[PDB]
Amino acid sequence: MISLIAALAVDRVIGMENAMPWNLPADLAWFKRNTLNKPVIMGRHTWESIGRPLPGRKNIILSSQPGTDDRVTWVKSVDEAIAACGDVPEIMVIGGGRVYEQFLPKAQKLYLTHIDAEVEGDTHFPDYEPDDWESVFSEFHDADAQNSHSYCFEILERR
Ligand SMILES: NC(=O)c1ccc[n+]([C@@H]2O[C@H](COP(=O)([O-])OP(=O)(O)OC[C@H]3O[C@@H](n4cnc5c(N)ncnc54)[C@H](OP(=O)(O)O)[C@@H]3O)[C@@H](O)[C@H]2O)c1
Ligand SMILES: Nc1nc(=O)c2nc(CNc3ccc(C(=O)N[C@@H](CCC(=O)O)C(=O)O)cc3)cnc2[nH]1
Ligand SMILES: [Ca+2]
Ligand SMILES: [Ca+2]
Numbered sequence: 001m002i003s004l005i006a007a008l009a010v011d012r013v014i015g016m017e018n019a020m021p022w023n024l025p026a027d028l029a030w031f032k033r034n035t036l037n038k039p040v041i042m043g044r045h046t047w048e049s050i051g052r053p054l055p056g057r058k059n060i061i062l063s064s065q066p067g068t069d070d071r072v073t074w075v076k077s078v079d080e081a082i083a084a085c086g087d088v089p090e091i092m093v094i095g096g097g098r099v100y101e102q103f104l105p106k107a108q109k110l111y112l113t114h115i116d117a118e119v120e121g122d123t124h125f126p127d128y129e130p131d132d133w134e135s136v137f138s139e140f141h142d143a144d145a146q147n148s149h150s151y152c153f154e155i156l157e158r159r
Contacts, residue, residue, distance in 0.1 A: 002082070004093045004100055005034055005111040006125050007151075013121030015096060018049045021121075026147045027113045031094075034111055039085040040092045043099040047072070057092075060084050062099060078102055097123040104128065108158050116150040134159050 039058035047061045059072040060081050067074030075081045085091045093103040104126050137155040
């Protein structure tokens with residue numbers, strides 16, 4: 001099974017200048033709890049943004065050119081990225097915008113955090129069709145001393 005996981009601010013904005021301009025450790029914790037001990041597939045810009053391998057995960061990086069770090073696995077196509085995950089129950093796709101667009105039609109489940117934050121951005125999650133998905137989990141949280149915006153964790157499954 002292929003799943004996407006992403007955090008979306010207003011108007012589906014997911015990044016600006018190769019960074020994520022919010023700070024929500026509650027959402028980083030959700031990300032870790034949902035990805036740990038799974039393979040993660042990401043694009044080269046997201047790799048550069050994160051800046052280091054994500055421990056306890058098989059990191060798979062898409063790039064059309066040769067890899068530059070043997071702490072991670074580098075592949076050159078969507079089909080090769082999937083294959084390098086081996087026979088696992090769940091493959092997590094962790095972005096960015098260009099990678100999410102390609103994996104969207106292949107995926108069975110979306111783990112989306114909806115952040116109540118107004119962000120000028122230059123990267124957007126794909127414009128996904130409502131009718132194709134069913135929401136199986138949602139959980140709203142107000143802002144607090146650690147998390148400066150409200151946020152909702154949703155899980156959707158493909159109908
Ligand atoms: N809010 C969130 O959850 C979230 C999650 C992830 C990322 N982000 C953000 O998203 C932004 C990055 O997104 P992005 O769209 O610019 O970049 P990206 O999708 O992360 O990376 C794009 C790059 O991946 C490689 N790639 C993609 N598809 C490929 C394919 N089919 N075959 C070979 N290589 C392929 C290419 O690398 P080469 O140019 O080397 O060929 C390409 O330029 C950043 O702002 C980041 O902070 C936000
Ligand atoms: N829900 C969600 N939130 C995100 O922030 C997010 N970010 C990306 C890509 N960027 C990032 C940036 C940092 C880390 C990171 O350092 N995570 C650590 C620590 C989590 C924590 O603070 O507890 C990890 O081990 O997962 C992961 C992905 C992809 N999907 C996401 N999905
Ligand atoms: Ca296009
Ligand atoms: Ca915004």
